[PDB]
Amino acid sequence: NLLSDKNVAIIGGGPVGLTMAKLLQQNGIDVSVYERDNDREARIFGGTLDLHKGSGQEAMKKAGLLQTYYDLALPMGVNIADEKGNILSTKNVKPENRFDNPEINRNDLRAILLNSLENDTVIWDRKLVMLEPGKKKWTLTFENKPSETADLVILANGGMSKVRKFVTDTEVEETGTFNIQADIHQPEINCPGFFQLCNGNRLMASHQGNLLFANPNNNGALHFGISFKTPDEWQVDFQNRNSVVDFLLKEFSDWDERYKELIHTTLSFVGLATRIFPLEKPWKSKRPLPITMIGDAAHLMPPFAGQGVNSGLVDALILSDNLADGKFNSIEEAVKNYEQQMFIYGKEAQEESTQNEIEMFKPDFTF
Numbered sequence: 001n002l003l004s005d006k007n008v009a010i011i012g013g014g015p016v017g018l019t020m021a022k023l024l025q026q027n028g029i030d031v032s033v034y035e036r037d038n039d040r041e042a043r044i045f046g047g048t049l050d051l052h053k054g055s056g057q058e059a060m061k062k063a064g065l066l067q068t069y070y071d072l073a074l075p076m077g078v079n080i081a082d083e084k085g086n087i088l089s090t091k092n093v094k095p096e097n098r099f100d101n102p103e104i105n106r107n108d109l110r111a112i113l114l115n116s117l118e119n120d121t122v123i124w125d126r127k128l129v130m131l132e133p134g135k136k137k138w139t140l141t142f143e144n145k146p147s148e149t150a151d152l153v154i155l156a157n158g159g160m161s162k163v164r165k166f167v168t169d170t171e172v173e174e175t176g177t178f179n180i181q182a183d184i185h186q187p188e189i190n191c192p193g194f195f196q197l198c199n200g201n202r203l204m205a206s207h208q209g210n211l212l213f214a215n216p217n218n219n220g221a222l223h224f225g226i227s228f229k230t231p232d233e234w235q236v237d238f239q240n241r242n243s244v245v246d247f248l249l250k251e252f253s254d255w256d257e258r259y260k261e262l263i264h265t266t267l268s269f270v271g272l273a274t275r276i277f278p279l280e281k282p283w284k285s286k287r288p289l290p291i292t293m294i295g296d297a298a299h300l301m302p303p304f305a306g307q308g309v310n311s312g313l314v315d316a317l318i319l320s321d322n323l324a325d326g327k328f329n330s331i332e333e334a335v336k337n338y339e340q341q342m343f344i345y346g347k348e349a350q351e352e353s354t355q356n357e358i359e360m361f362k363p364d365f366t367f
């Protein structure tokens with residue numbers, strides 16, 4: 001290894017960072033994962049993920065985890081509906097379909113990942129707040145915890161990473177759209193009409209630049225997302241479910257009872273403005289010590305065309321091969337190369353999601 005006598009700090013034990021830690025650790029590199037979450041049982045809010053043949057699945061295969069992912073994932077069909085509840089299209093799971101991109105729960109994926117690492121690989125309740133380039137090592141500062149040091153820092157702490165200044169002055173941007181999400185438990189009881197519309201399939205619906213996306217079966221809960229162009233007036237407060245309900249009922253008034261049932265029945269809503277971390281300018285080439293970024297820290301992008309975790313998992317695949325060698329002259333060259341590649345497929349991805357976001361939130365969209 002170019003790492004033989006050294007050690008690696010991965011900031012962030014998301015799917016991407018945990019994957020990075022796996023791939024490095026099986027080449028016998030010393031790696032720790034510093035994670036913000038309080039412990040391994042922290043619930044991860046969100047829909048399910050799906051790993052694609054060619055990308056995410058490749059990373060998993062290399063970790064020897066594909067079969068496990070297949071074991072836990074649920075292949076799903078997709079229904080496309082109008083605001084009036086007519087099914088316009090059902091694409092079902094077929095024999096050949098089955099392994100293409102089965103849905104996995106985010107906690108589930110993390111349990112598979114965590115399980116593959118040696119004990120104490122991840123250090124919990126570690127929120128990285130500061131980063132300083134020492135004599136030969138990075139000094140890592142954690143909120144109300146003892147500082148650590150590392151030879152190589154890998155930022156995998158997601159799209160809103162505050163700790164990026166040594167790589168790039170690029171800032172996260174809002175794209176102009178906005179997402180509301182909620183979970184519904186016992187959906188067969190709590191939103192029967194809608195649960196029945198979904199019929200064990202995912203559902204996508206579109207009316208007047210308001211998108212609805214639901215998975216009826218995220219480990220037994222209905223998860224759903226509503227997306228729209230951010231209202232120029234931004235007026236809603238996500239603390240107050242009453243104010244979020246009011247706004248959704250006005251925006252969705254045109255929609256069938258069964259979609260409204262969804263809003264009435266939701267106890268609380270997560271709001272989020274869609275953000276991008278653009279791969280616009282090249283990153284800094286004068287860097288004090290070895291540092292890099294993978295996943296959403298590297299290339300946060302709108303989620304709407306199913307880009308996201310797969311790109312990040314490729315980043316993990318590419319970087320760990322790059323470092324598992326007597327192939328590059330130095331860690332610095334192994335990072336340089338990783339970033340050169342990632343700029344290409346990353347940029348392509350970002351274009352695809354950006355166009356899609358423009359496409360989707362046009363007045364007259366048609367899936």
Ligand SMILES: Cc1cc2nc3c(=O)[nH]c(=O)nc-3n(C[C@H](O)[C@H](O)[C@H](O)COP(=O)(O)OP(=O)(O)OC[C@H]3O[C@@H](n4cnc5c(N)ncnc54)[C@H](O)[C@@H]3O)c2cc1C
Pocket residue numbers: 011012013014015016017034035036037047048049050126127128129156157158159179181225272294295296297303306307308309310312
């Ligand atoms: C509404 C929505 C829908 C989406 N749908 C999809 C989809 O269908 N498919 C898809 O592929 N992608 C989707 N995405 C994007 C996808 O979830 C991300 O690409 C993926 O989770 C990125 O993984 P990551 O590990 O890079 O970052 P994250 O999953 O965000 O993980 C970063 C980790 O670092 C931790 N962390 C953060 N700050 C610190 C700190 N200071 N110190 C230590 N740890 C820290 C976090 O707790 C987290 O564990 C969606 C995103 C949104 C917002």
Ligand SMILES: [Xe]
Pocket residue numbers: 210226227228248251252
């Ligand atoms: Xe909306």
Ligand SMILES: [Xe]
Pocket residue numbers: 212226252259260262263
């Ligand atoms: Xe809705």
